Amino acid sequence: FIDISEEDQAAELRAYLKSKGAEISEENSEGGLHVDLAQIIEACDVCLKEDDKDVESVMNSVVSLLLILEPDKQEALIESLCEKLVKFREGERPSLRLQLLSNLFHGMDKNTPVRYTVYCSLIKVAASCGAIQYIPTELDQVRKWISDWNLTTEKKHTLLRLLYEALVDCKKSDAASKVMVELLGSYTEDNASQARVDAHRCIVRALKDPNAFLFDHLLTLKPVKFLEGELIHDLLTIFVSAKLASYVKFYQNNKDFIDSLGLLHEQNMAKMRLLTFMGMAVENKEISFDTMQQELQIGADDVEAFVIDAVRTKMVYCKIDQTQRKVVVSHSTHRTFGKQQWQQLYDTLNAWKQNLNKVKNSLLS
Amino acid sequence: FPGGRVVRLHPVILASIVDSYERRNEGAARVIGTLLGTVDKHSVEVTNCFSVPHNESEDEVAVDMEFAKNMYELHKKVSPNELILGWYATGHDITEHSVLIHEYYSREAPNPIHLTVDTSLQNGRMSIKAYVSTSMGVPGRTMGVMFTPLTVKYAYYDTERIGVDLIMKTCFSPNRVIGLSSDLQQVGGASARIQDALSTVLQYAEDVLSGKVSADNTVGRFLMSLVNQVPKIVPDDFETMLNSNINDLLMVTYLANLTQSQIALNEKLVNL
Amino acid sequence: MHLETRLVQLDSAISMELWQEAFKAVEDIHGLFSLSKKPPKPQLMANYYNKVSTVFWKSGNALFHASTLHRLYHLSREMRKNLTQDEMQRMSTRVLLATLSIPITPERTDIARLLDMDGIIVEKQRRLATLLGLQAPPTRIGLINDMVRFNVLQYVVPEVKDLYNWLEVEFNPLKLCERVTKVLNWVREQPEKEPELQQYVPQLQSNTILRLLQQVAQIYQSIEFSRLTSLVPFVDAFQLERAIVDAARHCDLQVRIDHTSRTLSFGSDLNYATREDAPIGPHLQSMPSEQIRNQLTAMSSVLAKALEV
Amino acid sequence: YLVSAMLLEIPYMAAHESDARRRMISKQFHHQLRVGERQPLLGPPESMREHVVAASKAMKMGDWKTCHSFIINEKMNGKVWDLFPEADKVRTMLVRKIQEESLRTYLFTYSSVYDSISMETLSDMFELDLPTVHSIISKMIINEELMASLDQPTQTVVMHRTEPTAQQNLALQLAEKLGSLVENNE
């Protein structure tokens, strides 16, 4: 690349800085000038015909980017041009294409093929270097306007399906999922049939790692209220396990995926978490030690160390007396009706106190 | 990886924008300056800035780079925080005059980092769009530059942006400080009632049918997070603790007032 | 003919057990060296820095020793490029040097001279730091990660690699008692592993207690110390019990010291001021369980409110 | 060291109007205002580095540095009583280091032990039952006793109550001054 800041007419000045391009590129570059203004064949040429063998060109590829925005069908020649980005197998100068074509800044996110084009490209381009900074680039305008063309919605649904295993992580998996599942849930992909495999994904997010705390991030907003519990999946499987505390209530509910996953550590984890919670919410946010001994069916020292497992769960987060005040505040598992009736008695308790507190402090203010 | 992602300035950049813009030396429409700050090599964390002499029009623009070095000399002396990362202008984005000030700053010639402040009657458009200029090959014309966006972040001294929070209280209606903490109780009250009016509609929406969607285990998670720290669960020995603290704190200020009287009885017996 | 005139002044003094005039000599070598930036600073300075190391190893705190050893780690690896040592045994020796030196002192006992203007020599620490090359006097274990920033984490020898993977990384109530001192008794192997490696161990044992009591103090809040003597099977029974209270009196945590029936609770919370985190800098990785105090009222009430608003 | 670093480590926690102005601070401001120390060599530092641990009582550590290398440097040999002046010194180290946790380290100490205290520091039970009794009446300490059980319940609470009294270290030295103002006036 040499400068583009002359009269525009970027077409035959890209042709100039394509003379130094690939041999397959520059054998069409100056030839295009005889044809037309040549932002159709000569523009698609450096896209069709591969680079010399390095991404030293990209400074010219930014010209080729902004040279089909206004003149050509942008989206048609920007679906390709962003297939070279993986065909090269690098994501740093292919990434400067992705960054300046991210959204709404030289490109103008339509209607949202422009977000997808670079999104699905970047997916193939980088490991997850460019890919991570597109959770904001997506979610910032998810909150203002979701893609009206459900084609673009199921485009990003397939993206958020394979961005499960694309970036090597389990909480990124949860993040990209609880985007996949949330716009699936609210309005998308019903399509009850093509939501079925997505239920098998959402149960993996519930089960493989314990990041519904048991089944709360599947029941709270709409991740089962959409992805139906007692559909053909039996997603209520983990809800039959959610209050019960027994090997049988995970093992009779064990079907032929987690039969071989398998289940021998998370059983005890999620079991003593649902017991910890409903223990706390009963007897009564300050329960006794020998009650928990009999509850969790083991003796003293292990259960006293399961208090430390439960304060790291962040479900029961406070100071632990040895003989009393065992499970404590922060009711982190599902209290689906009890938290709602408590929300009304607490906004009552607020309107009772904090409104009294206004005129109280305002006496000396 | 691309360096053009984000500028994390804070409203002191807008301080030396607006004061400079509204005195201006009658630089009517276009006030411009050279931005000074740090870089995380991905982010651009910035503290301060300054407005320079310009006369930008078609096709005359001046940035006294001798003076920009004079100001940097005085700026680096003021605080060692910053390097001249580029130039910040008022309205607007890519011009043929931007790229003239580009080649003026390719006399300087670190990474070109620009900050364009839209001067329009809008809301949806941001009052600043921070830009870097890659590609950036350029042995040709003036400078082949490509404006890639830097997200506008305010990430510095939190008590400063508490100072800005007060400035945004003055933006609505000043809001002078005599009873700061006195009428921060009125602020704390207003906050606690917005919480109440929030929680009420959340309940009564599901009391009818299909409400409290985005609240159940988020606002409910952060309603038990209210009672996490206030109140203390229900200990009446904690009532006893803090009414015994009332006995302590009253008695701290009690002899503070005994010193108040003693100030006059000490230094004003001087006046006989 | 001057630095070697003063470096024989230094070795002779420290060999004669003369630490006052030894300090005067480590001042003199730098009083001369202050007018020795004019030469391209020589790379046979490992001598000077390993001698002021040996000078600090027992006199000054392992704090200033470890800070000196970091400036060795920087300089004498700039050497390993230029000097060009093909030494993996020295790589083990110098990483364990920099590590073993770090986790020694949680807090300094400056209240014997808080009577009559304490802050003086607490500030003079900066003048000591002038001779090291530092300006800001040294941090604690915060340092160790300021060169785990470098390839310390890989280069360190598997004798001790998986010992800080307990101390700094894996925070446990009871899974460190028989996980530090076991393989530190495996460190004690006498002759071939540089008897230099040894004299870190009495503070290593002390420091391990000073970490993991603040753990079980803010993990549990009432254990009975007829069992706790078994929970931590260190070489001590008596001196460890009066090391429990030594930590309490010298401002690490809050415990009920000398109970007759020997029930030692930790409480909730009752005296949260500065003797909780010893003083302000916490000795507790991601445990820190719920204590309650001032202003949390307003700002937790509006934080929790406005997370979803 | 036995009439100053013991008698006056009681009122040195925010109660300064008993400071005897002729003591070790003749030299304690000297061999502490030095940027470097180690194993002491002189007399005064070898008469200090066991004193500094006689603040962190350590009966072990303080007894072990008045008998380090002095039996050549005139402590044991010279005082024409061969071994007995140490048997005196050791006793006034053993005993004057039980009168320390009493006066210093009593904050969270409510229930304490006075049989095990005899096992720790090895003095005679009566020669410890005497001074542990003395600790209350002689030094008017806030700690209770029923010594048929050989015990001393404390119930001290003074820690953030002596801070507002450390305000009365100076709130007195405001209103103790108005007592002296009008003495001069008329």
Added chain:
Amino acid sequence: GGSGDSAVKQVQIDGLVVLKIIKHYQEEGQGTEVVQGVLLGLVVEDRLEITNCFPFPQHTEDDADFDEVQYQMEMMRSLRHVNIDHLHVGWYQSTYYGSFVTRALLDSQFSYQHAIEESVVLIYDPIKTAQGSLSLKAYRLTP
């Protein structure tokens, strides 16, 4: 309103003026004699409303030594270039002390207000004021 004795005025601190202070809040100088700079505005409607004010950066690491006045007048010529004159309506400070007036700068600002009666001295301290009323106070050595 905020009229003074024979000449001197109120000060109006606009929201970007406190930000010109809190950019050097406590950074470089904790327990130092921080002179946060000179406040320059103009004699305007009963309250000399601030335009700009930049921190007069003494030998800033440990102690406080007043700089070359070359910076003062060349910087406030740097302001003259596209902005208002050095209409120095006082000097201002932080200075890790809520609710004080210093002895040496008391003398300095009296002599300042001796040269120009129409001058005030601002003392903005952050929440180190203890929250804690009246963080900003524009004190003056009296008529």
